[PDB]
Design an enzyme around this catalytic site. Structure first.
Site, PDB file in Angstrom:
ATOM      1  N   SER A 276      -2.539 -18.092   6.802  1.00  0.00           N
ATOM      2  CA  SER A 276      -1.985 -18.492   8.092  1.00  0.00           C
ATOM      3  C   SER A 276      -1.666 -17.311   9.001  1.00  0.00           C
ATOM      4  O   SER A 276      -1.343 -17.540  10.169  1.00  0.00           O
ATOM      5  CB  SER A 276      -0.732 -19.338   7.874  1.00  0.00           C
ATOM      6  OG  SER A 276      -1.046 -20.549   7.197  1.00  0.00           O
TER       7      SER A 276
ATOM      8  N   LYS B  66      -3.618 -17.347  12.247  1.00  0.00           N
ATOM      9  CA  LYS B  66      -3.259 -18.155  13.413  1.00  0.00           C
ATOM     10  C   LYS B  66      -2.973 -17.261  14.627  1.00  0.00           C
ATOM     11  O   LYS B  66      -3.055 -17.713  15.771  1.00  0.00           O
ATOM     12  CB  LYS B  66      -2.068 -19.048  13.081  1.00  0.00           C
ATOM     13  CG  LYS B  66      -2.430 -20.223  12.157  1.00  0.00           C
ATOM     14  CD  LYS B  66      -1.257 -21.184  11.947  1.00  0.00           C
ATOM     15  CE  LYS B  66      -1.634 -22.343  11.021  1.00  0.00           C
ATOM     16  NZ  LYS B  66      -2.051 -21.846   9.657  1.00  0.00           N
TER      17      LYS B  66
ATOM     18  N   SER C 242       3.242 -23.459  10.889  1.00  0.00           N
ATOM     19  CA  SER C 242       1.955 -23.086  10.308  1.00  0.00           C
ATOM     20  C   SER C 242       1.096 -24.325  10.069  1.00  0.00           C
ATOM     21  O   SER C 242       0.628 -24.596   8.963  1.00  0.00           O
ATOM     22  CB  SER C 242       2.163 -22.293   9.014  1.00  0.00           C
ATOM     23  OG  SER C 242       1.036 -21.483   8.748  1.00  0.00           O
TER      24      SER C 242
ATOM     25  N   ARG D  12       9.106 -13.296   1.066  1.00  0.00           N
ATOM     26  CA  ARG D  12       8.324 -12.570   2.057  1.00  0.00           C
ATOM     27  C   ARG D  12       9.236 -11.959   3.111  1.00  0.00           C
ATOM     28  O   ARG D  12       9.200 -10.750   3.356  1.00  0.00           O
ATOM     29  CB  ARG D  12       7.296 -13.502   2.702  1.00  0.00           C
ATOM     30  CG  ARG D  12       6.254 -14.052   1.731  1.00  0.00           C
ATOM     31  CD  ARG D  12       5.410 -15.131   2.388  1.00  0.00           C
ATOM     32  NE  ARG D  12       6.226 -16.278   2.790  1.00  0.00           N
ATOM     33  CZ  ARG D  12       5.754 -17.353   3.402  1.00  0.00           C
ATOM     34  NH1 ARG D  12       4.463 -17.448   3.692  1.00  0.00           N
ATOM     35  NH2 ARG D  12       6.578 -18.335   3.718  1.00  0.00           N
TER      36      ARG D  12
HETATM   37  C1  LIG Z   1      -1.386 -29.375   2.036  1.00  0.00           C
HETATM   38  C2  LIG Z   1      -1.157 -27.967   1.574  1.00  0.00           C
HETATM   39  O1  LIG Z   1      -1.345 -27.001   2.310  1.00  0.00           O
HETATM   40  N1  LIG Z   1      -0.758 -27.818   0.308  1.00  0.00           N
HETATM   41  C3  LIG Z   1      -0.678 -26.524  -0.354  1.00  0.00           C
HETATM   42  C4  LIG Z   1       0.756 -26.125  -0.686  1.00  0.00           C
HETATM   43  C5  LIG Z   1       1.542 -25.555   0.473  1.00  0.00           C
HETATM   44  C6  LIG Z   1       0.915 -25.206   1.657  1.00  0.00           C
HETATM   45  C7  LIG Z   1       1.635 -24.704   2.725  1.00  0.00           C
HETATM   46  C8  LIG Z   1       3.015 -24.542   2.650  1.00  0.00           C
HETATM   47  C9  LIG Z   1       3.803 -24.140   3.843  1.00  0.00           C
HETATM   48  C10 LIG Z   1       3.800 -24.923   4.998  1.00  0.00           C
HETATM   49  C11 LIG Z   1       4.548 -24.559   6.104  1.00  0.00           C
HETATM   50  C12 LIG Z   1       5.311 -23.408   6.078  1.00  0.00           C
HETATM   51  C13 LIG Z   1       5.327 -22.607   4.943  1.00  0.00           C
HETATM   52  C14 LIG Z   1       6.140 -21.340   4.912  1.00  0.00           C
HETATM   53  O2  LIG Z   1       5.616 -20.335   4.383  1.00  0.00           O
HETATM   54  O3  LIG Z   1       7.287 -21.368   5.422  1.00  0.00           O
HETATM   55  C15 LIG Z   1       4.573 -22.978   3.833  1.00  0.00           C
HETATM   56  C16 LIG Z   1       3.637 -24.865   1.447  1.00  0.00           C
HETATM   57  C17 LIG Z   1       2.913 -25.369   0.381  1.00  0.00           C
END
Ligand SMILES: CC(=O)NCCc1ccc(-c2cccc(C(=O)O)c2)cc1
EC number: 3.5.2.6
Length: 242
Positions: free
Chosen positions: A47, A50, A95, A227
């Site tokens: 991400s 982005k 994200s 992080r």
């Molecule tokens: C569907 C999928 O993507 N599953 C895979 C597992 C997954 C993916 C994205 C995040 C995530 C999303 C938004 C923010 C953050 C952050 O870093 O704060 C992290 C958390 C778990």
């Protein structure tokens, strides 16, 4: 010009993890890292992509401005904040992968490839699916290459309009108080080993800017908060923030 400070490894070891922090002092044009090798090892941007994706979408008119609403496609996904309408600000904040996947589809392979080369971004390789290559395709970027890219963005030197760069830097806003401003983007790469987390951006002070890029092993989502936490502990140790 580049200095290695292995004492920072304590910030990773104490949390039973491994990673790299790279700092760049803009005033002094000096860099600092705990691990010169890993600072130059290339990972999936996940991400953090982005940032360039937003720049390209804005400059081509795929995204009109930071207020344009990208309607939820009605498909329930497992991240609750993704199941709602977004603009550029909230899509970056949360994200929201599916919003940016549509950006990439509208940008298209050819324009995406040209722009990443113009940006000198990572290995500039979009091999894979146009709507997921930054998650499981051929593109790779190192922590030092992230800083090189961010420095250009900060100075409005990327080969897109000033407006596009100002909007993306607005969307990168993460934290601000009377002592500092942080503009940054997190990343979380799980589709290709090794699984890692990213945090890249910069700290604005009254009289200097400190660019940073960190990545760290992320075997489970439980450690994602490290992080920002590890990065800020390094910033505190170096007296960059209180
Ligand atoms: C569907 C999928 O993507 N599953 C895979 C597992 C997954 C993916 C994205 C995040 C995530 C999303 C938004 C923010 C953050 C952050 O870093 O704060 C992290 C958390 C778990």
């Amino acid at each position: 010009e580049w200095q290695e400070n292995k004492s920072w490894n304590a910030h990773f070891t104490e949390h039973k993890s491994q990673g790299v922090v790279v700092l760049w002092n803009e005033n002094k044009q000096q860099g600092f890292t705990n691990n010169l090798k890993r600072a130059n090892q290339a990972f999936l941007p996940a991400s953090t992509f982005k940032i360039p994706n937003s720049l390209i979408a804005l400059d081509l008119g795929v995204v009109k401005d930071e207020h344009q609403v990208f309607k939820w496609d009605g498909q329930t996904r497992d991240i609750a904040t993704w199941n709602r309408d977004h603009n550029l600000i909230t899509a970056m904040k949360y994200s929201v992968v599916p919003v940016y996947q549509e950006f990439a589809r509208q940008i298209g392979e050819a324009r995406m490839s040209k722009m990443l080369h113009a940006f000198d971004y990572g290995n500039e390789d979009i091999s894979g699916n146009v709507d997921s290559f930054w998650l499981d395709g051929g593109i790779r970027i190192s922590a030092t290459e992230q800083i090189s890219f961010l420095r250009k963005l900060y100075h409005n030197k990327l080969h897109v309009s000033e407006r596009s760069q100002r909007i993306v830097k607005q969307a990168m806003l993460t934290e601000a108080n009377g002592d500092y401003i942080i503009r940054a983007k997190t990343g979380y790469s799980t589709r290709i080993e090794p699984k890692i987390g990213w945090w890249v951006g910069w700290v604005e002070l009254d009289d200097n800017v400190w660019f940073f890029a960190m990545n760290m092993d992320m075997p489970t989502s439980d450690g994602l908060g490290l992080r920002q936490a590890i990065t800020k502990e390094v910033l505190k140790q170096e007296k960059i923030i209180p």
